[PDB]
Amino acid sequence: KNIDGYFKIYSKHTPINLVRDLPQGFSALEPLVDLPIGINITRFQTLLA
Amino acid sequence: KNKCVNFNFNGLTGTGVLTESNKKFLPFQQFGRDIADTTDAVRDPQTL
């Protein structure tokens, strides 16, 4: 999320027991890092190994 | 601590009695609020 130029990022890592490729329940994502970048973004792409 | 004094915590102004906190705080937390959106606990800008 780009919050007024601050590209704030959230994250969370938990264990699971996969059933249908996306387990359900509830969680809460904590903030990872504040990045006062101030650059406009409109698209993205993943970097797969 | 334990004295009625003013505050300026990197702009977080106020006046009250400073005491030891018994609450937790996230690694990025700056300050906590009460039920009325008023500042209750603050992180020192130089100390953890």
3-state secondary structure A1-49: CEECCEECEEECCCCCCCCCCCCCCCCCCEEEECCECCCCCCCCCCCCC
Beta strands B31-33; B39-42: pairing state? antiparallel
Q: How was this structure determined?
A: cryo-EM
Largest pairwise CA distance in chain A: 40
Q: What residues contact residue B29 under an 8 Å CB cut-off, 6+ apart?
A: B43
Looking up tokens 């780009």 gives A2
The whole-angstrom separation of Cα B17 and Cα B7 is 10
CB pairs under 8 A between A and B: 4
Q: Which residues of A touch B26 (CB under 8 A)?
A: 30-31
Q: How far is CA A15 from CA A10, A18, B23, in A?
A: 17, 10, 27
Judge contact between B33 and B41, C-beta under 8 A: no
DSSP conformational letter for B13? E
Q: Which residues of A touch B29 (CB under 8 A)?
A: none
Q: Is some CB atom of chain A closer than 8 A to the CB atom of B26?
A: yes
HSE-CB for B31 with a 13 A CA cutoff: 17
Q: Report chain A residues touching chain B, CB-CB < 8 A.
A: 30-31, 34
Q: Specify the resolution in Å.
A: 3.4
Q: Which residues of B touch A34 (CB under 8 A)?
A: 28
Q: What are the structure tokens assigned to B37, written together?
A: 């959106």
Q: Which helix (H) or strand (E) holds B39?
A: strand B39-42
